[PDB]
From TrEMBL, chain A:
Is modified by deamidation of its C-terminal glutamine to glutamate by the deamidase Dop, a prerequisite to the subsequent pupylation process. Belongs to the prokaryotic ubiquitin-like protein family. The gene is pup. Strongly interacts with the proteasome-associated ATPase ARC through a hydrophobic interface; the interacting region of Pup lies in its C-terminal half. There is one Pup binding site per ARC hexamer ring. Signal peptide: none annotated. It comes from Mycobacterium tuberculosis. Protein modifier that is covalently attached to lysine residues of substrate proteins, thereby targeting them for proteasomal degradation. The tagging system is termed pupylation. The lineage of its organism: Bacteria, Bacillati, Actinomycetota, Actinomycetes, Mycobacteriales. This is Prokaryotic ubiquitin-like protein Pup. The N-terminal unstructured half of Pup provides a signal required to initiate unfolding and degradation by the proteasome but is not needed for pupylation, while the C-terminal helical half of Pup interacts with ARC to target proteins to the proteasome.
TrEMBL record, chains B, C:
Homohexamer. Assembles into a hexameric ring structure. The lineage of its organism: Bacteria, Bacillati, Actinomycetota, Actinomycetes, Mycobacteriales. The chain holds residues 97 to 589 of 609 of the full protein. It comes from the Bacteria. One of its GO terms (cellular component) is proteasome-activating nucleotidase complex. This is AAA ATPase forming ring-shaped complexes. Residues 172-328 form the AAA+ ATPase domain. ATP binds at G183, C184, G185, K186, T187, L188. The keyword Cytoplasm does not apply. The keyword ATP-binding applies. The gene is mpa.
Amino acid sequence: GSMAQEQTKRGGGGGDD
Amino acid sequence: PPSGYGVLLATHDDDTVDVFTSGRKMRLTCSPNIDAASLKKGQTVRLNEALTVVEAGTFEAVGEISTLREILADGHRALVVGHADEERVVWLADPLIPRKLRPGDSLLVDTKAGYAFERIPKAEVEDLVLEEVPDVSYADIGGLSRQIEQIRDAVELPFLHKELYREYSLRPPKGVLLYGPPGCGKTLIAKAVANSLAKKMAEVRGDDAHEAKSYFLNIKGPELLNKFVGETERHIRLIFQRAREKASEGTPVIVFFDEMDSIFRTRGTGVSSDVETTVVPQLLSEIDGVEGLENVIVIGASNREDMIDPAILRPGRLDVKIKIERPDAEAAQDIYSKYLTEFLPVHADDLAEFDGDRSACIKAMIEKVVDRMYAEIDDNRFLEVTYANGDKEVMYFKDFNSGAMIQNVVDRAKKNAIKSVLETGQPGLRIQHLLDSIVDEFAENEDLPNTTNPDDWARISGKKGERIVYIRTLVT
Amino acid sequence: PPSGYGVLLATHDDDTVDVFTSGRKMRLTCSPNIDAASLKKGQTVRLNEALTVVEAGTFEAVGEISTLREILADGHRALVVGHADEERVVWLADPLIPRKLRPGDSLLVDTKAGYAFERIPKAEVEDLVLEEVPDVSYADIGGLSRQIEQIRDAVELPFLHKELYREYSLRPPKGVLLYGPPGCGKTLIAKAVANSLAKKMAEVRGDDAHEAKSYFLNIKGPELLNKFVGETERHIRLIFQRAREKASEGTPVIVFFDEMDSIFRTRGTGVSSDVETTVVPQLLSEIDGVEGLENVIVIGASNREDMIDPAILRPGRLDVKIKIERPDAEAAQDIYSKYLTEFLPVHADDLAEFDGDRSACIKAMIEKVVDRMYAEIDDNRFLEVTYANGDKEVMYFKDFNSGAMIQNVVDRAKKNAIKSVLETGQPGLRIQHLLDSIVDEFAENEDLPNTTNPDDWARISGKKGERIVYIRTLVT
Ligand SMILES: Nc1ncnc2c1ncn2[C@@H]1O[C@H](COP(=O)(O)OP(=O)(O)OP(=O)(O)O)[C@@H](O)[C@H]1O
Ligand SMILES: Nc1ncnc2c1ncn2[C@@H]1O[C@H](COP(=O)(O)OP(=O)(O)OP(=O)(O)O)[C@@H](O)[C@H]1O
Ligand SMILES: [Mg+2]
Ligand SMILES: [Mg+2]
């Protein structure tokens, strides 16, 4: 059970004005 | 006289027309100079202090870009979707209502006026994959006469004789893979193929400046990875869609994937968050597909074929497979002949030995250096291997020779010759320069080995029958 | 006195110019003072309450920046994507229509006007690491002459004699590796080559410091690793694009990777994370691929030669593998001469015997101290290395010596001298102080070694044929 790091993936957001 | 502009909206019988200006639509009369019949929908017009149309020009050339979604039944309206997924209905311009308006195309639009002025081909695939054509040819590759024949056949013969292929109903292969130890000529073969394809396309058609090389799509390994969740899959689909569109019966499309180790990794078995379980199935579905992709060949180059997913290597998807191995004595001689051209300056003593015979002296040098490199002597003992039971096996430098190190040897020999010229003043290249280059190269490269078992180690273990358990350098 | 401003858009033959001002496009007449012929698209102009163009000006310098997406066929326009994924077609101004505006360049633009002007990325932060150029040159490095000769031949020589290399058809080396035990002086050469390059750029091109420093990049190691997937590879691609842009076949760009093992591995040694499995193929493609770096040199420094991936440690990528060995007696003398400068204060006791001859006294002191530290006496015994064979070997403190240790000894001697002058009031470094510092240092670095250390004992174990099983400190 070796500890492992992570890399996340962003999700686009919808913003107006 | 300062006069503002506006955009025409519609034409009426009363010689009064709607003009969008200052962010609003106003019904304005036209000057007697301009003709109402000559006006066209979406054409930019001129205003003045009295807000009277005086001069009419052309359609708008700048603005936002929105992909065309659906043309309405009347044909004068089109529904499109914006960058942030906003659905808007616009009126097509006169030129839009040769070029064919099709769903999914991009259009130049202005939100305030709500008109589409032109269709702009995105051609996003032309970006990030095009490169300047390398000058390497097939004649610059030595020691490979069988593999080059295979790849040359698989690339040209279905297109050299199409009638004979259709007579036997033989489809051209759509998967070519090149694998072997590092620095053995895979990228060299890829560059030669790209150069040959570019020259052939420039011969067949015009536009030699550009697009002639558009048929070769070079993609680096991690170049397609993207931060967002679905952007990479969409990029894969778009690249394959363009490859399908660009392909023709007589024009091949070669999508080359460099460093096949990164992408196409075996699904799962990733400790970090390099999620391949989404990207790899996309590639498999695009290459195989519910419908067979036509006139496309994908070429992949890698030095680690073990980490590649079994599904992508399945025959039919990547059926044509080519292995490039370590050069032998004859291949080393061929490579040296490729690099040691007759045009290279030679020392006066070497020419005097053969009475100025350039080719004889060059081939004598090549034979001597090749014999020295591959000779089994105590000084050339590179590594010592102990198997599970095995024996004390001795690997020499001939077991690790490659075209790259031959090129490096020639380069450092030329550097030594330049140093001798600067220090002594006698131009030329000596055989002793080659021998010193060889010994220096081996001395610099004898620090490579590490306690790991790549494909060459696996081959050696299979040949001996016992697994590799110890390796040591023969420093003294 | 109150005068407005606007942006030029296009010119006509009617002595009229289109100007964008106050959020609207107008056509205006130029004053007789200004000539419309010299005007260029995108230039900023001055207006007035009478709405007349009176004077041209430089282009806009600030605003939003938008990554370039593609270049249109006409060449006067290009598609650019905004920050929130909005795409617009914008004209290209005069300065962009120097280096080609290649796709992937965040261009400075005004969305309302619809024109481009400039660009840049985050890789410049690497140039910010070397804000101060080190003042150490080759004259400050001692004990290494062959290594300095090789590093000068790899970098300075190809650009010093372009014609000779062109005649011999020889290209500058693509990469250089420096490897050796810790503290042996790798970073010293790494910063000396940067200082020399800065001096060359200052003296040749221009006296500006920023441009001179711009030709050296300092990676610092794991600075490339990022949180999100596919961003580190993009950073590497940007770094190499920046490197290829500055090259001009006569100006080298040196990208220095420090601690090569941090980000490069054998693609299987990664246990917790496997980011290197994706990072390595990207760099391999960048270094050598279909399109290759013509005039870029990559210098890497590491303490673990074997742990680097075999693909990187290949001829054609890392051509010369310079090895820096631990200093011998002559190297120790050279380092002490480089540190024990003639101008240091010296006690009158030392000068009494040598009639005040500072240089001779310092040389004699250096020889005495190097003889003291390089002595095979029972007081210098450090460790007992055993093997399975049983050939027990006694190691001395001289074996585990480096320039860093010599510098530390000199610093300790200076501290002792300053304490003596503070307590007693007689200045001057004494010979006995150096001997005391040596024995104190060898006492302080005594209980360092752990149970097993693969640092430098692997080479000795391979030399003896057997592996180390026990080591003990032999003190008292
Ligand atoms: N006949 C030949 N066989 C092998 N190598 C050659 C030959 N002729 C020239 N070379 C040299 O070998 C070098 C490396 O070749 P290539 O780039 O094809 O291998 P590679 O794809 O980089 O291998 P890897 O990707 O595993 O490092 C080239 O720079 C080329 O100059
Ligand atoms: N001729 C020399 N050889 C070795 N070291 C020297 C020499 N002259 C001075 N030094 C000193 O040695 C110290 C260490 O040198 P350097 O920083 O190059 O090693 P390093 O690259 O940090 O080693 P590592 O990266 O393995 O830690 C420097 O601070 C320098 O003052
Ligand atoms: Mg390659
Ligand atoms: Mg260092």
